[PDB]
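Objective 1.3, modelling of assemblies. Example input:
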Amino acid sequence: VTTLETHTVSLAEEAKDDMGRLCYLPTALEARSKYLRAVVNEELISTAKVTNKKSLAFTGGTNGDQSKISTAAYLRAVKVLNNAPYMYTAVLGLGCYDNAAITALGKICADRLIDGFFDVKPTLTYAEALPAVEDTGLLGTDYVSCSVYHYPFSCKDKWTQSRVVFGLSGVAYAAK
Amino acid sequence: SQYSIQQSLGNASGVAVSPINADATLSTGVALNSSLWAGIGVFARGKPFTVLAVTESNYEDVLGEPLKPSSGSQFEPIRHVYEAIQQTSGYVVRAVPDDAKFPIIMFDESGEPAYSALPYGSEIELDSGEAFAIYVDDGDPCISPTRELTIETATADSAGNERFLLKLTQTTSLGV
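Predicted structure (tokens):
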């Protein structure tokens, strides 16, 4: 058993810690904590009380199946990435193989004046690898800063010591 | 995003860059005006049968792009102008053949365009219909590149007179 972190919280509206920091449960959790958040009803809080409890575990957390993801989710994630207010000078593929996601990323890198490092599915043989590039839609005179890589090789994984195959954006960005 | 950089300026306060062009050259210079030369010639663009003004900066614009040695022997005057432009200004006069024509767009009462062309010298007249017509005068044939006209409505004035914004745009061969 390992303890992450503890803090002193209160259910009162204006309870203040001895150091002056706030102790209201939503503000206290949203200010200093990094793992949990809370929501408090605004009508029963005045008379609400608490007790002593031990080992309250979370049950029901599940991320579903990560193998299949809808294209709409990828589009929303790309749109979120487009609006992030930060410096980044290279957009990597990071494994997405959907054509629409790659097209949106290509639209991204031609708008911030940066350079992408996308790729295609490594399982494709040499014959059908060529049609995939124009299937992506990157080819043209607009997305002039991107680049497409292919890598039909199987290596030994660093963690599981198994025969796995993965793309090639990371090495290209490391070289850059 | 606030990090995006657009391509062509609109009306918002911002700084934008254009796509990386290759088939274009530039030159800079400051006029001296110690002794001005003059002389007739034959070129592309420019108002025919009217004295122009040529400096070391706008000679690529008012006098058009250079002609081609392959197309007959009409390439002499632009080379001569370049040779003597690195010293002072100029007062070249352009002359055109009789069969040279300039485009004209004429509008009806309902607002339907009707393309047409007319030779130089002759004044433009309007028939019983076709309320007003607008034509270019720079003399460029508008074949390479192409110039397009865009008309959009706008806010009326205090007296109630209708006003519409008129926009003239140029489309390059590539697509920009």
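The longest helix of chain B spans residues 76-83.
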